[PDB]
A paper describes a structure:
[name] ([name]) seals broken strand breaks by joining two adjacent ends during DNA replication and repair transactions. [name], the main replicative ligase, serves a critical role in the maturation of Okazaki fragments by ligating >50 million nicks during DNA replication and finalizes DNA excision repair pathways by an ultimate ligation step. Furthermore, in line with our previously solved [name] structures, we demonstrated that [name], which consists of oligonucleotide-binding, DNA-binding, and adenylation domains, completely envelopes the nick. Here, we determined the crystal structures of [name]/nick DNA complexes with 3′-8-oxodG and 3′-8-oxorG templating A or C during the pre- and post-catalytic steps of the ligation reaction.
In the present study, we further utilized the LIG1EE/AA mutant to crystallize the protein in complex with nick DNA substrates harboring 3′-8oxodG:A, 3′-8oxodG:C, 3′-8oxorG:A, and 3′-8oxorG:C. In addition, we used the [name] wild-type (LIG1WT) for crystallization with nick DNA containing 3′-8oxodG:C. We determined the structure of [name]/nick complex with 3′-8-oxodG:C for both the wild type and the EE/AA mutant. The overlay of LIG1WT/3′-8-oxodG:C and LIG1EE/AA/3′-8-oxodG:C structures revealed no difference in the orientation of 3′-OH with respect to 5′-PO4 at the nick, which also confirms the presence of E346A and E592A amino acid substitutions at the high-fidelity site. We solved the [name]/nick complexes containing 3′-8-oxodG:A, 3′-8-oxodG:C, and 3′-8-oxorG:C at the pre-catalytic step of the ligation reaction referring to the formation of a DNA–AMP intermediate. We observed Watson–Crick base pairing for 3′-8-oxodG:C and 3′-8-oxorG:C and Hoogsteen base pairing for 3′-8-oxodG:A and 3′-8-oxorG:A. We observed that LIG1WT/3′-8-oxodG:C and LIG1EE/AA/3′-8-oxodG:C moved by 1.3 Å and 1.2 Å, respectively, versus 3′-8-oxodG:A. The deoxyribose of LIG1WT/3′-8-oxodG:C and LIG1EE/AA/3′-8-oxodG:C moved +2T nucleotides by 0.6 Å and 1.8 Å, respectively, leading to shifts of 0.6 Å and 1.2 Å, respectively, at the +2A position of the template. In the ligation assays, we showed the mutagenic ligation of nick DNA substrates with 3′-8-oxodG:A and 3′-8-oxorG:A and an efficient nick sealing of 3′-8-oxorG:C, while the end joining of 3′-8-oxodG:C was greatly compromised by [name]. Furthermore, 8-oxodG:A base pairing in -syn conformation provides more flexibility at 3′-8-oxodG toward the 5′-PO4 of the nick, whereas 8-oxodG:C base pairing in -anti conformation restrains the movement of 3′-8-oxodG toward the 5′-PO4 of the nick.
Author numbering: 262 to 361, 364 to 373, 377 to 384, 395 to 750, 756 to 902
The structure:
DNA sequence: GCTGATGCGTG
DNA sequence: GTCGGAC
DNA sequence: GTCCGACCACGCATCAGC
């Protein structure tokens, strides 16, 4: 019966076309039949609709199962502030699949571990979700063998395509072409066509029957926006879905409101090609340029009562990471400030030298540090936006209003709390001077944001309303030494390449980084046909990769390619220019990207390791 | 008790 | 984080 | 333009195997 569930049929009847009786639990084969339908198409509009159909039947037949199927669709375990980690990777999964042959026999890997995984009672969407959370809670000695027993049990109770999606979910890559934005769209459409909370049989099955083409289309877009904006204020399905089922989507904003202590999605940013693009994109609109600091974003929450909370860009609870900010919280606020959401950037600060350390020094800090004195790498917050002030939300306020509120209610404590360096002007000469000074002041670039025109703190309108003017968006010449196999959208062809530089004194090619972005499918096919006969079974003696990942296809060094990167970093695993700067660490590329092939050059004529050292030395650090 | 492997988050 | 693909 | 999934380096935290 559930083998024939087709949530992609025309005139889908949520009750008759369902595959489970009302009041019963949604079987996992139902959501697995839906997944197979979503991955068989490419248009998101047909993806959002096929999902949405399953969400109708769930809202009508088994309401309490809605939250589990949404998370199973999102491939998540709950709200990000919780932090439940699966702790299961490819190795753990392969072991569980064999216990249902041999680990070497299961080492086929197509690309996709689900295909390799392909009497008990049938599986349940809630039961599978509770088993996923059980796996996540398993910690301590022999916790792995406990996880593998649970996973082993799932694969035995799997049927049809259940084995390929359970394995995909646990591996962390469902690869459905459907993510959070379409899941919300499918949910908003679902509850608008089938309202929740109807006595069975539901008096309304399809609330878009008596509407025109423009009517339903415009209606569903307005309904989706009410849900999308509220999610951006409360990204917590455990907090939205109970309210959604109780009071409809129309009343959802009246209860799920932007509150301190509950994280909210921050304003993203889109890269600007140059000053010409930011001037054209912000035509006749005022624009302020700030210094994009190179650190980790800190969302400082000040709940009414004194409890301080700190979240990350992805709503991860970072309170235990910054006890110093939890202590210095009152030093940055004014007496009238009773509750506030500060949008700051946490960068490493050397209190002795009064300078900002690079990003790597920030990452050497402890994640769960109960000892405040044991914190060596100090931090200084750079506040650049305010989203809340004394019981009031500032989402619908322009940037000029939020800026004047931050500057008039927060004290600049030099060395620990300083406002971001800003410059409000339109002269192309002043913009270049501020851009050159930002790199001179140890910053990655310049942020460009409006002050009044489309300058509110609203994600659903445009999550990428801010502009990023980084210097690398305005290069090295390295040889290939090997190729890697592709996974997912890269199966059957090449996925990443390992590049190397030429050490003149050592007379050996030294691996400097891997390269897996910046090329089209036609260029990747041109790379395959060109670097095909160069396949070598063993590495050449002049090649040296040190601790880098051994390429699946050793290549005869003969291809010189141009690679651009953001920064040069000291590498713990690469041998490029080891000893030239650090005694035991080489040099690698931050954010590498492929540019073009240099057919005019040979491996001998490429970026030397001595050059890589000089480039790293002339890097403001 | 330690270490290598690795999961997973940060960009 | 950067990037291209499909729509 | 949006949304999504390819891919990059690197750091802490965890744990099986020893």
């Amino acid at each position: 019966d559930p083998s024939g569930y087709n949530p992609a049929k025309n005139n889908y009847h949520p009750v008759e076309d369902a595959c489970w009786k009302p009041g019963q639990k949604v079987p996992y084969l139902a959501v697995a039949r839906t997944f197979e339908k979503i991955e068989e198409v490419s248009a998101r509009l047909r993806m959002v609709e096929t999902l949405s159909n399953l969400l109708r039947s769930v809202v009508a037949l088994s309401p309490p199962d809605l939250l589990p199927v949404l998370y199973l669709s999102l491939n998540h375990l709950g709200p990000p502030q919780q932090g439940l980690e699966l702790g299961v990777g490819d190795g753990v999964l392969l072991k569980a699949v064999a216990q249902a042959r041999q680990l070497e026999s299961v080492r086929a890997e197509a690309g996709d571990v689900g295909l390799v995984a392909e009497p008990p009672p049938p599986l349940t969407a809630s039961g599978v979700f509770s088993k996923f959370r059980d796996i996540a809670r398993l910690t301590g000695s022999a916790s792995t063998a406990k996880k593998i027993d649970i996973i082993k049990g799932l694969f035995v109770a799997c049927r049809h395509s259940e084995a390929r999606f359970i394995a995909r979910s646990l591996s962390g890559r469902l690869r459905l072409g459907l993510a959070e934005q379409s899941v919300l769209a499918a949910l908003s459409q679902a509850v608008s066509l089938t309202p929740p909370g109807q006595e069975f049989p539901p008096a309304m099955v399809d609330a878009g029957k008596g509407k025109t083409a423009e009517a339903r289309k415009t209606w569903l877009e307005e309904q989706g926006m009410i849900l999308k904006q509220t999610f951006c204020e409360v990204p917590d399905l455990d907090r939205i879905i109970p309210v959604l089922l109780e009071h409809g989507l129309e009343r959802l904003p009246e209860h799920c409101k932007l509150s301190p202590g509950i994280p909210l999605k921050p304003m993203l940013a889109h890269p600007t090609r140059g000053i010409s693009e930011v001037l054209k994109r912000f035509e006749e609109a005022a624009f302020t340029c700030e210094y994009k600091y190179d650190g980790q974003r800190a969302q400082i929450h000040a709940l009414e009562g004194g409890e301080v909370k700190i979240f990350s860009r992805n709503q991860e609870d970072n309170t235990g990471k910054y006890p110093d900010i939890i202590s210095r919280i009152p030093k940055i606020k004014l007496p009238s400030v009773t509750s506030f959401i500060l949008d700051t950037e946490a960068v490493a600060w050397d209190r002795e030298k009064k300078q900002i350390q690079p990003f790597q020094v920030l990452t050497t800090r402890k994640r769960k540090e109960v000892d405040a004195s044991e914190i060596q790498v100090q931090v200084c917050l750079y506040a650049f936006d305010l989203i809340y002030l004394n019981g009031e939300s500032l989402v619908r306020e322009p940037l000029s209003r939020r800026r004047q509120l931050l500057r008039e209610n927060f004290v600049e404590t030099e060395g620990e709390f300083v406002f971001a360096t800003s410059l409000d002007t339109k002269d192309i000469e002043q913009i270049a001077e501020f851009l050159e000074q930002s790199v001179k002041d140890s910053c990655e670039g310049l942020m460009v944001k409006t002050l009044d025109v489309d300058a509110t703190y609203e994600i659903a309108k445009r999550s990428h309303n801010w502009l990023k003017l980084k210097k690398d968006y305005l290069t090295l010449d390295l040889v290939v030494i090997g190729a890697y196999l592709g996974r997912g959208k890269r199966a059957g062809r090449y996925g990443g390449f390992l590049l190397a530089s030429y050490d003149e004194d050592s007379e050996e090619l030294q691996a400097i980084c891997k390269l897996g972005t910046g090329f089209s499918d036609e260029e990747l096919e041109e790379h395959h046909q060109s670097l095909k006969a160069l396949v070598l079974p063993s590495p050449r003696p002049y090649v040296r990769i040190d601790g880098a990942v051994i390429p699946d296809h050793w290549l005869d060094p003969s291809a010189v390619w141009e690679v651009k990167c953001a920064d040069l970093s000291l590498s713990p695993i690469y041998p490029a220019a080891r000893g030239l700067v650090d005694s035991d660490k080489g040099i690698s590329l931050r954010f590498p990207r492929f540019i073009r092939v240099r057919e005019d050059k040979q491996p001998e004529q490429a970026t030397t390791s001595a050059q890589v050292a000089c480039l790293y030395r002339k890097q403001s650090q």
